[PDB]
Amino acid sequence: ATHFDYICIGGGSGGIASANRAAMYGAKVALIEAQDLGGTCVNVGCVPKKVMWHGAQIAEAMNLYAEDYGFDVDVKGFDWSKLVESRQAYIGRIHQSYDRVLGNNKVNVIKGFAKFVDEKTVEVNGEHYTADHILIAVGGRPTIPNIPGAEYGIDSNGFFDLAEQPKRVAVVGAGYIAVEIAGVLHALGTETHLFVRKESPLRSFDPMIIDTLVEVMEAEGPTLHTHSVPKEVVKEADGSLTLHLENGESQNVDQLIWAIGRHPATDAINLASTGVATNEKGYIKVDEYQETNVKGIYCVGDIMEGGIELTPVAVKAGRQLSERLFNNKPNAKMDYDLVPTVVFSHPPIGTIGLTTQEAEEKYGKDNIKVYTSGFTAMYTAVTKHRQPCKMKLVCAGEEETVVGLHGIGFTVDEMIQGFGVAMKMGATKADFDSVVAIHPTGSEEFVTMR
Amino acid sequence: MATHFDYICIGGGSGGIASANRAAMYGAKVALIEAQDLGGTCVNVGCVPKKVMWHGAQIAEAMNLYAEDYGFDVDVKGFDWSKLVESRQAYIGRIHQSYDRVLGNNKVNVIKGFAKFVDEKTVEVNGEHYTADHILIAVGGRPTIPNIPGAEYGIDSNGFFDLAEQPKRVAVVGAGYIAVEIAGVLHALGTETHLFVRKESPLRSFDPMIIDTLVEVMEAEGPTLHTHSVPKEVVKEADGSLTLHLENGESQNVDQLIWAIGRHPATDAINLASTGVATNEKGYIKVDEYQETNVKGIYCVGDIMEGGIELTPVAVKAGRQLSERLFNNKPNAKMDYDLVPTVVFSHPPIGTIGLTTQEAEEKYGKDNIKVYTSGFTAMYTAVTKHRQPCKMKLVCAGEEETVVGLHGIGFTVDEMIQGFGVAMKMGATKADFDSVVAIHPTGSEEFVTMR
Ligand SMILES: Cc1cc2nc3c(=O)[nH]c(=O)nc-3n(C[C@H](O)[C@H](O)[C@H](O)COP(=O)(O)OP(=O)(O)OC[C@H]3O[C@@H](n4cnc5c(N)ncnc54)[C@H](O)[C@@H]3O)c2cc1C
Ligand SMILES: Cc1cc2nc3c(=O)[nH]c(=O)nc-3n(C[C@H](O)[C@H](O)[C@H](O)COP(=O)(O)OP(=O)(O)OC[C@H]3O[C@@H](n4cnc5c(N)ncnc54)[C@H](O)[C@@H]3O)c2cc1C
Numbered sequence: 001a002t003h004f005d006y007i008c009i010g011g012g013s014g015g016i017a018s019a020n021r022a023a024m025y026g027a028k029v030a031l032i033e034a035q036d037l038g039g040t041c042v043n044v045g046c047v048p049k050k051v052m053w054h055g056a057q058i059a060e061a062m063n064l065y066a067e068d069y070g071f072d073v074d075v076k077g078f079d080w081s082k083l084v085e086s087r088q089a090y091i092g093r094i095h096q097s098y099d100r101v102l103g104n105n106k107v108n109v110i111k112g113f114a115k116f117v118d119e120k121t122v123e124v125n126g127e128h129y130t131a132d133h134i135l136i137a138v139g140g141r142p143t144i145p146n147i148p149g150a151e152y153g154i155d156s157n158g159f160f161d162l163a164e165q166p167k168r169v170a171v172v173g174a175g176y177i178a179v180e181i182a183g184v185l186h187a188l189g190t191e192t193h194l195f196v197r198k199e200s201p202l203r204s205f206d207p208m209i210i211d212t213l214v215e216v217m218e219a220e221g222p223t224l225h226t227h228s229v230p231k232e233v234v235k236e237a238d239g240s241l242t243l244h245l246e247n248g249e250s251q252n253v254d255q256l257i258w259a260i261g262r263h264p265a266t267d268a269i270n271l272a273s274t275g276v277a278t279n280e281k282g283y284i285k286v287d288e289y290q291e292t293n294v295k296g297i298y299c300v301g302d303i304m305e306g307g308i309e310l311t312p313v314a315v316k317a318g319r320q321l322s323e324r325l326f327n328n329k330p331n332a333k334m335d336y337d338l339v340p341t342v343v344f345s346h347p348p349i350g351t352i353g354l355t356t357q358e359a360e361e362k363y364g365k366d367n368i369k370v371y372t373s374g375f376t377a378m379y380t381a382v383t384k385h386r387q388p389c390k391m392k393l394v395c396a397g398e399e400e401t402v403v404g405l406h407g408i409g410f411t412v413d414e415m416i417q418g419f420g421v422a423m424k425m426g427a428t429k430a431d432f433d434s435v436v437a438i439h440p441t442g443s444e445e446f447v448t449m450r
Numbered sequence: 451m452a453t454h455f456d457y458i459c460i461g462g463g464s465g466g467i468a469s470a471n472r473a474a475m476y477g478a479k480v481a482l483i484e485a486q487d488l489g490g491t492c493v494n495v496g497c498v499p500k501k502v503m504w505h506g507a508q509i510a511e512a513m514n515l516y517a518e519d520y521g522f523d524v525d526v527k528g529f530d531w532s533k534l535v536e537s538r539q540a541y542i543g544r545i546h547q548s549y550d551r552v553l554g555n556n557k558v559n560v561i562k563g564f565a566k567f568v569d570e571k572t573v574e575v576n577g578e579h580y581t582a583d584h585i586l587i588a589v590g591g592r593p594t595i596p597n598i599p600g601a602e603y604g605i606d607s608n609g610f611f612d613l614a615e616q617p618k619r620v621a622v623v624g625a626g627y628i629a630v631e632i633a634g635v636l637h638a639l640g641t642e643t644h645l646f647v648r649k650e651s652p653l654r655s656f657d658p659m660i661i662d663t664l665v666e667v668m669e670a671e672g673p674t675l676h677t678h679s680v681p682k683e684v685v686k687e688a689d690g691s692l693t694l695h696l697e698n699g700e701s702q703n704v705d706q707l708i709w710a711i712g713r714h715p716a717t718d719a720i721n722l723a724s725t726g727v728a729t730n731e732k733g734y735i736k737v738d739e740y741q742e743t744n745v746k747g748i749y750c751v752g753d754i755m756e757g758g759i760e761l762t763p764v765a766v767k768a769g770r771q772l773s774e775r776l777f778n779n780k781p782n783a784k785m786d787y788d789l790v791p792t793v794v795f796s797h798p799p800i801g802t803i804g805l806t807t808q809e810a811e812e813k814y815g816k817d818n819i820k821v822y823t824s825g826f827t828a829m830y831t832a833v834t835k836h837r838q839p840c841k842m843k844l845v846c847a848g849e850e851e852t853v854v855g856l857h858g859i860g861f862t863v864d865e866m867i868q869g870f871g872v873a874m875k876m877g878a879t880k881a882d883f884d885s886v887v888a889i890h891p892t893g894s895e896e897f898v899t900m901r
Contacts, residue, residue, distance in 0.1 A: 040891070047829075050891050054830050057518040059511050062524065066513070069506040070533035073513065076523040082521035086833045093832075295543070312888040339887045350889075378498075379505050382537040413867040417894035418869020420886040426875050435871040436790040437763040438801075439492070440501045443868035444763070 002129035004030040009138035012039020013311040014301035018318030023105035025326040034113040041311040051087040056187030068383035080165035103329035115270040140262040149233030153256040166255040173259030174201045176343040181347035182222040192222035206355040264303035301379045340420040349418035354404035363396040377410040400429035415443040452579035455481040463490020464762040465588035465752035469769030475555035476777040485564040492762040502538040504795045507638035519834035531616035567721045591713035591753045600684030604707035617706040624710035625652040627794040633673040634739040634797035643673035657806040717752035791871040801867040805855040822900040828861040851880035866894040
C-alpha cells in the first residue's frame with residue numbers, strides 16, 4: 001500500500017480546504033474524489049443556484065421595475081438551455097482553478113470511490129492507501145420520501161440536470177433549498193407550487209422573516225401550500241405528475257422536486273471496519289478538534305454530528321484541522337457559534353444568531369429588547385411593485401448585546417458579513433449606534449433603529 | 451417685538467430638520483426656517499434623485515450588458531428620460547409629505563422664507579423678527595461655477611436634475627464623487643459622456659487601488675476620461691451645442707456641460723457680520739467639538755462647518771446630538787467625526803472607511819503597516835462577456851493589525867460596508883475579521899477571507 005502523511009476522503013468543500021492547507025505546510029496529501037472536484041457546492045449547490053438566482057433577478061428587473069424607470073422593453077423570450085451552458089461553463093473554470101491550486105500544492109488527486117479496509121487503510125480502484133491521519137469529508141445526498149410514485153420526482157441534482165424549463169413545478173420542502181428553487185423558478189416564468197408540511201416555510205427563522213417571505217410569495221411569488229403532507233405521486237396518462245396530499249387535495253404538474261432534507265453519505269464507505277462511532281442518522285461523532293473516537297480519523301462538513309450544513313463551515317473546519325495537525329497549533333479548532341446565513345430567496349434573507357423566541361427562552365422575555373425597521377427599498381419604491389424590507393436586532397441584557405440580527409429585502413444578502421464580525425466582537429446596540437450611517441442604502445436601516 | 455422661541459434652526463435641510471425634530475421631541479418650541487424646499491440638498495437635488503437614477507442606470511446595464519448571457523432575448527425599444535424624472539419627483543414628493551407629517555406631530559413651526567441675522571440672538575424673515583437663546587446655522591452649500599468666459603452656458607448639479615429630456619452628449623467637468631456619479635449614470639443610460647479632470651485622475655483622495663480600478667473600468671465600459679484638462683472657455687456655437695475649450699488646446703463639442711468642480715458654503719448674504727461669528731477664507735464657520743461658534747448661543751452643523759464632513763448622515767447626527775445636549779441635558783453628547791463610512795455611486799460603486807494605504811504609512815510608518823487585498827470577478831458578471839473586476843483592501847497598523855482602513859469597489863459593495871463600520875468603531879483587528887465565518891456565495895465574504 002502507498003503511504004501518505006494525510007488522506008482526505010471527499011474532494012468537496014471540506015476535503016479540498018483541508019488537503020490544500022495541509023500541503024502548504026509540507027504534507028504529502030492524497031485527495032480522493034469519485035465524481036467532480038468541489039462537491040455539492042461547486043457542482044450542484046451554491047454556485048449553480050446563485051447563477052440562476054442572478055438570472056431570475058434580471059427577469060424581475062425587466063418584468064417588474066424597468067417600465068417605471070422609463071424603459072420600453074420587450075422580453076421576447078428566455079432560453080433556459082443558454083443559461084445552463086453559461087452556468088456550466090463557469091463551473092468549468094472553477095474546476096481548472098482547483099486543478100491549478102491542487103497542482104501547485106503537490107496534492108495527489110485520485111479519481112475514484114474510497115472505502116475503508118481498516119482504521120488506517122482505504123481502498124480506491126483496487127489499490128490500498130494508508131496514512132497516519134485520515135479525513136472523512138464525504139458529505140450528503142438528497143432524501144427521497146418512501147411513498148408510492150416517489151421515483152417520479154427529482155431532487156436538487158436532477159433539477160440542475162434539467163436541459164429545459166419545465167412549464168409547471170411542484171417544489172416539496174420547507175427548508176432554504178426548496179424556497180430558493182421555488183423562487184428562482186417562479187421568477188423565470190414557471191408555474192410554481194411550494195408544498196410545506198406545516199404552517200409555513202423556514203420554520204427555524206424569525207417570525208418577521210417568515211411573515212414577510214409569505215406575504216411577498218402570495219403577491220408576486222410561487223403559490224404556497226401549507227399543511228401539505230405528500231401521500232402519493234400519480235403518473236397520469238398524459239405524462240404529468242399528480243401530487244396527492246394526505247389532507248385530500250392534489251396538484252397536477254410537469255416535474256416535482258423533493259427538497260425535504262439530506263442525509264450523510266456514511267453508509268457505503270465500510271465504516272464498520274474502522275471502529276468509528278456514528279449516531280442513529282449516520283452522522284459521525286467528533287470532539288471539538290474534529291477527531292472521531294478512533295485516533296487518526298477525523299471528520300468535517302455535512303456528515304459531522306452537530307455541524308452546520310454550509311460550505312464555509314466545512315472550509316474553516318478543514319483548514320483549522322490542517323493547522324492543528326501540520327502547523328503545530330494544538331488549540332486550532334472551529335467556532336460553530338454566530339455563523340451567518342443567507343438564503344437566496346425572492347427577496348433574499350440574511351440572519352445571524354438567535355430568533356426573537358430563541359432569545360426569550362435563553363434569557364427570559366423581560367430581559368430582551370427588540371428593535372425593528374420596516375421600509376421599502378428605494379430601488380422598488382419608485383415602481384408599481386412596492387416590495388417590503390424588514391430588519392430586526394434582538395438584544396439581551398442591560399447592555400443590549402445583539403444576540404440576533406435578521407433581514408429580508410433587496411441586497412440584504414450582501415450587508416450581513418460585516419455585522420457578523422461586530423457580533424463576533426460582542427457588539428451591543430450602543431456599538432451599532434456609534435457608527436455613522438451610509439445614505440442612501442438599505443444597510444443604514446440596521447444602524448438607525450430606535 | 452421679536453417672537454420668542456427656545457430654538458431657531460436656519461436651513462431646513464438634513465442638519466436643520468434632524469436637529470429641530472429632536473429638540474422638539476424634548477418639549478422645545480422650535481422655529482425651522484427654510485427659503486426653498488424642505489429636505490434641502492439631499493432630498494431634492496442630491497442623494498435621493500441621484501440614487502433613483504443610479505438604479506435606472508443599473509437596470510440599463512442589466513439589460514444591455516448581461517441579459518443575453520443569462521439567456522434572455524430582449525428588445526430595449528427605448529428609454530424615456532421624462533418618465534424617470536416623473537417617477538423620481540413623485541418619490542421625492544412622498545418624502546415631502548412625510549416631513550410635513552413628522553414636523554407637524556412635533557409642533558415645529560416651519561417658516562417659509564430667507565433668513566438674515568439681525569444680531570447675536572435675532573434673525574429676520576419676511577419682515578418679522580424671531581429671537582431665541584439657541585440658534586443653529588445649517589444653510590448648507592451651493593455649487594461652484596468657475597469664472598471663465600461662457601461659464602453661464604454650463605449647468606451644475608441642480609440644473610442636471612432640472613433636465614426633462616436626455617442630452618445626447620455631455621461634458622462633466624470635475625474630479626469629485628459628484629462628477630463621477632453623474633458621468634457614470636449618463637454613460638450607462640445611453641449618453642455620450644466625457645469626464646474632464648484637471649490632474650491625473652478623478653477621486654484623487656481615495657486609495658490608489660480604487661482609483662486604478664475605476665479608471666480601468668471607465669476606459670473599457672464607462673465614460674471617456676480626459677486628464678490634465680483645465681477649462682479655459684465655453685463657446686456657444688451657432689447650432690445650439692456647446693464647445694468646451696481647454697488650456698492645453700483640446701476641445702469637445704457637447705449638448706450640455708455640467709460643472710461639478712466643488713461646492714462653497716451659503717454663509718454670505720445672511721448678515722453674519724452682525725453676530726460676531728467668524729468664518730475662514732472659504733466661508734466655513736469654525737465650531738468647537740459641541741458645534742458651538744465663538745459666540746454663545748450660535749451653533750452650526752453640516753456642510754458649512756469648518757473641518758466637517760459633507761454627507762447627510764453627518765449633518766443629521768451632529769444636529770441630533772446637539773439637541774440631545776441642549777434640550778435633553780446631556781452635556782457630553784457630541785458628534786464623532788472619526789471612521790465615517792463613505793459610498794460613491796459610481797459604475798461600479800465604491801465603499802471606503804478610514805485611512806488610505808499612504809495615509810496609514812505617514813501616520814504609523816511604512817514598516818508598521820500591513821496591507822491585505824482581494825481581486826475577484828463578481829459571479830453576477832463572471833458568467834457574461836462583460837466581466838467586471840472587484841477589488842477590496844484592508845489597511846492594518848500595529849502588531850495587533852488594527853484595521854485602520856477598508857476599501858472596496860465592485861457590484862453591491864455599496865451595501866456591504868455599514869456592518870464593517872460597526873466593527874471598526876469597536877477597534878477591529880485582522881484577527882476579528884478572521885473570527886467570523888464567511889457567507890458563500892457573496893461578494894462580501896472577500897473582505898474576511900484575505901490572507
Ligand atoms: C441545492 C443546494 C444549495 C446549496 N447552497 C448553499 C449556499 O448557497 N451556501 C452554502 O454555504 N452552502 C450551500 N449548500 C451546502 C453546501 O453545498 C454543503 O454544506 C457543502 O458542500 C458541504 O461540504 P462537504 O465537504 O461536507 O461535502 P461535499 O462538498 O458534498 O463533498 C463531498 C464529496 O465527496 C465525494 N464522495 C462521496 N463519497 C465518496 C467516497 N466514498 N470516495 C470519494 N469521494 C466521495 C462526493 O462526490 C463529493 O464531491 C447547498 C447545498 C445544496 C444541496
Ligand atoms: C449631487 C449631490 C449628491 C449628493 N449625494 C450624497 C449621498 O449620496 N450621500 C450623502 O450622504 N450625501 C450626499 N450629498 C451631500 C448632502 O446632500 C449634504 O452633505 C447635506 O445635504 C448637507 O446638509 P446641510 O443641513 O448641511 O445642508 P442642506 O441639506 O443643503 O440644507 C440647507 C438648507 O438651507 C436652506 N437655506 C440656505 N440659506 C438659507 C437662508 N438664508 N434662510 C433659510 N434657508 C436657507 C436651503 O434652501 C437648504 O434647504 C450630495 C450632494 C450633492 C450636491
